Enzyme design. Structure first.
Site, PDB file in Angstrom:
ATOM      1  N   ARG A  29      44.992  30.698  39.326  1.00 49.00           N
ATOM      2  CA  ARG A  29      45.990  31.473  38.636  1.00 49.00           C
ATOM      3  C   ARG A  29      47.087  30.465  38.340  1.00 49.00           C
ATOM      4  NH1 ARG A  29      49.855  33.419  36.562  1.00 49.00           N
ATOM      5  NH2 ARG A  29      50.406  35.641  36.524  1.00 49.00           N
ATOM      6  N   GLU A  37      48.101  41.299  30.281  1.00 48.17           N
ATOM      7  CA  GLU A  37      46.926  41.885  30.900  1.00 48.17           C
ATOM      8  C   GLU A  37      45.891  42.382  29.914  1.00 48.17           C
ATOM      9  OE1 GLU A  37      46.494  42.450  34.533  1.00 48.17           O
ATOM     10  OE2 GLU A  37      44.488  42.487  33.598  1.00 48.17           O
TER      11      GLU A  37
HETATM   12  C1  THP Z   1      51.502  33.353  39.538  1.00 44.69           C
HETATM   13  C2  THP Z   1      51.521  34.062  40.940  1.00 44.69           C
HETATM   14  C3  THP Z   1      51.006  35.304  41.109  1.00 44.69           C
HETATM   15  N1  THP Z   1      51.200  35.991  42.298  1.00 44.69           N
HETATM   16  C4  THP Z   1      50.854  37.429  42.448  1.00 44.69           C
HETATM   17  C5  THP Z   1      51.981  38.339  41.971  1.00 44.69           C
HETATM   18  C6  THP Z   1      51.215  39.542  41.572  1.00 44.69           C
HETATM   19  O1  THP Z   1      50.810  40.337  42.701  1.00 44.69           O
HETATM   20  P1  THP Z   1      50.536  41.926  42.553  1.00 44.69           P
HETATM   21  O2  THP Z   1      49.113  41.949  42.242  1.00 44.69           O
HETATM   22  O3  THP Z   1      50.925  42.377  43.881  1.00 44.69           O
HETATM   23  O4  THP Z   1      51.441  42.370  41.470  1.00 44.69           O
HETATM   24  C7  THP Z   1      49.970  39.026  40.911  1.00 44.69           C
HETATM   25  C8  THP Z   1      50.285  38.713  39.457  1.00 44.69           C
HETATM   26  O5  THP Z   1      49.148  38.102  38.902  1.00 44.69           O
HETATM   27  P2  THP Z   1      48.365  38.704  37.669  1.00 44.69           P
HETATM   28  O6  THP Z   1      49.178  38.351  36.485  1.00 44.69           O
HETATM   29  O7  THP Z   1      47.026  38.029  37.649  1.00 44.69           O
HETATM   30  O8  THP Z   1      48.387  40.121  38.040  1.00 44.69           O
HETATM   31  O9  THP Z   1      49.701  37.821  41.650  1.00 44.69           O
HETATM   32  C9  THP Z   1      51.757  35.371  43.423  1.00 44.69           C
HETATM   33  O10 THP Z   1      51.864  35.851  44.559  1.00 44.69           O
HETATM   34  N2  THP Z   1      52.166  34.099  43.246  1.00 44.69           N
HETATM   35  C10 THP Z   1      52.150  33.400  42.090  1.00 44.69           C
HETATM   36  O11 THP Z   1      52.706  32.310  42.146  1.00 44.69           O
HETATM   37 CA    CA Z   2      47.781  37.851  33.198  1.00 52.85          CA
END
Ligand code: THP
Ligand code: CA
Length: 135
Positions: A29, A37
């Site tokens: 990620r 999304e």
């Molecule tokens: C980019 C990133 C995402 N995330 C988490 C936040 C979001 O959690 P929640 O699922 O609890 O909202 C999710 C967002 O990613 P997505 O954009 O793939 O959903 O991944 C982190 O914890 N750290 C990061 O540095």
């Molecule tokens: Ca995304």
């Protein structure tokens, strides 16, 4: 920071992909950004979501070299995803998306924010040019 080679396995969306890292397949990620999304029914298919997916896919599939660059904090999120800056032939995908208006700078959790200022500066340019997300 330090860049390490990786091998593209499968592009998933604008900000998530599967890579072969240190011998093991793993999903990554992109740090400090958020592309729209296209899955999760809660968000539904967001505008520019498909655009960001295509941009990322193209950029990583045509690359002769992909490199992952972890920041100085935790290297994985709660879902077991690797957190990094990813480079396609020396070009940071994270920045490329922000600069085109296909992602917003987000989830800035220190100390994992070494490139925050660079990314914001590009977001500001995409913004003043009213690109995609900013139009
Ligand atoms: C980019 C990133 C995402 N995330 C988490 C936040 C979001 O959690 P929640 O699922 O609890 O909202 C999710 C967002 O990613 P997505 O954009 O793939 O959903 O991944 C982190 O914890 N750290 C990061 O540095
Ligand atoms: Ca995304």
């Amino acid at each position: 920071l330090h860049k390490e080679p990786a091998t593209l396995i499968k592009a998933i969306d604008g900000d998530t992909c599967k890579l072969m890292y240190k011998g093991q397949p793993m999903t990554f990620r992109l740090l400090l950004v958020d592309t729209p999304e296209t899955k999760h029914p809660k968000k539904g298919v967001e505008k520019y979501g498909p655009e960001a997916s295509a941009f990322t896919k193209k950029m990583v599939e045509n690359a002769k070299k992909i490199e992952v660059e972890f920041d100085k904090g935790q290297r994985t999120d709660k879902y077991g995803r690797g957190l990094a800056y990813i480079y396609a032939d020396g070009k940071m995908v994270n920045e490329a998306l922000v600069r085109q208006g296909l992602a917003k700078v987000a989830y800035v959790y220190k100390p994992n924010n070494t490139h925050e200022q660079h990314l914001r500066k590009s977001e500001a340019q995409a913004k003043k040019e009213k690109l995609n997300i900013w139009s």
